[PDB]
Ligand binder design. Structure first.
Ligand SMILES: *[C@@H]1O[C@H](CO)[C@@H](O)[C@H](O)[C@H]1NC(C)=O
Ligand SMILES: *[C@@H]1O[C@H](CO)[C@@H](O)[C@H](O)[C@H]1NC(C)=O
Lengths: 50, 175
């Protein structure tokens, strides 16, 4: 899925990933020690799965 | 001698334009030129609506090339002759999309959508999609994607919200 769409889904930083989860329908794949920080400050976001 | 000089905002590029406008006849090799001259002070984002080759995975008898700037072999952005065409993003406001096709590979067809855009900090008369887009505000609710993921096409449907007032009709509003 990602290699077909590298100009669209592969963001350039962790901040462009969090904003596209918010402003769009998107399922950014971030490492689990950043998700524990973001999903406590922001309350819109969650950690899907293990 | 096609030379489909297209310009302005969002237009359509159709491979059937050579058949609708009698530039070639069925039964010969075609070689068209689709110049896509931008709005003043802009850049061009090609995206592929339809793309289907008669002889896939073979560049010697059909392909679609997306020459940007002017036509020269140096600035060849992408040369598609396989099954899928990925959406390129040109650097100038001018591109020289062609299509080669052999007599046998005549049924090969494509359909694109070129869109003018500027730098990130948009203003009035410009809508902002992310990743370097300043598409026109006419392109919002155009019914087409003029960006990435359909961001210009959202919150653009408003009919009614009701209960039994929704069904005052040939449903139970008659009974
Ligand atoms: C999360 O979404 C709610 C619902 O609209 C919104 O009011 C809030 O500002 C958002 N952000 C948070 C809690 O940081
Ligand atoms: C782009 O600008 C206006 C918005 O101000 C838009 O309504 C119009 O359709 C477009 N005009 C041209 C010449 O592309």
């Amino acid at each position: 899925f990602m290699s077909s769409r590298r100009q669209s889904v592969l963001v350039k930083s962790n901040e462009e990933g969090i904003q596209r989860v918010l402003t769009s329908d998107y399922a950014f794949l971030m490492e689990s020690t950043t998700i524990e920080f973001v999903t406590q400050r922001n309350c819109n976001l969650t950690q899907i799965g293990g | 001698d096609c030379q489909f000089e297209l310009s302005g905002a969002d237009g359509i590029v159709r491979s059937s334009q050579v058949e609708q406008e009698e530039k070639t006849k069925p039964g010969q090799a075609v070689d068209c030129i689709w110049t896509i001259k931008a709005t003043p002070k802009a850049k061009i984002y090609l995206r592929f609506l339809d793309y289907q080759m008669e002889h896939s995975n073979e560049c010697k008898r059909n392909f679609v090339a997306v020459y940007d700037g002017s036509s020269a072999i140096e600035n060849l952005k992408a040369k598609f002759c396989s099954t899928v065409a990925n959406d390129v993003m040109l650097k100038t406001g001018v591109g020289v999309i062609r299509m080669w096709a052999d007599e046998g590979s005549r049924l090969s067809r494509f359909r694109m959508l070129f869109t003018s855009f500027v730098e990130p900090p948009c203003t009035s008369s410009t809508f902002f999609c992310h990743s370097n887009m300043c598409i026109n505000n006419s392109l919002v609710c155009n019914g087409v994607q003029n960006c990435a993921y359909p961001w210009d096409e959202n919150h653009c449907k408003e009919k009614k919200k009701a209960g039994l007032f929704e069904q005052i009709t040939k449903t139970h509003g008659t009974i």
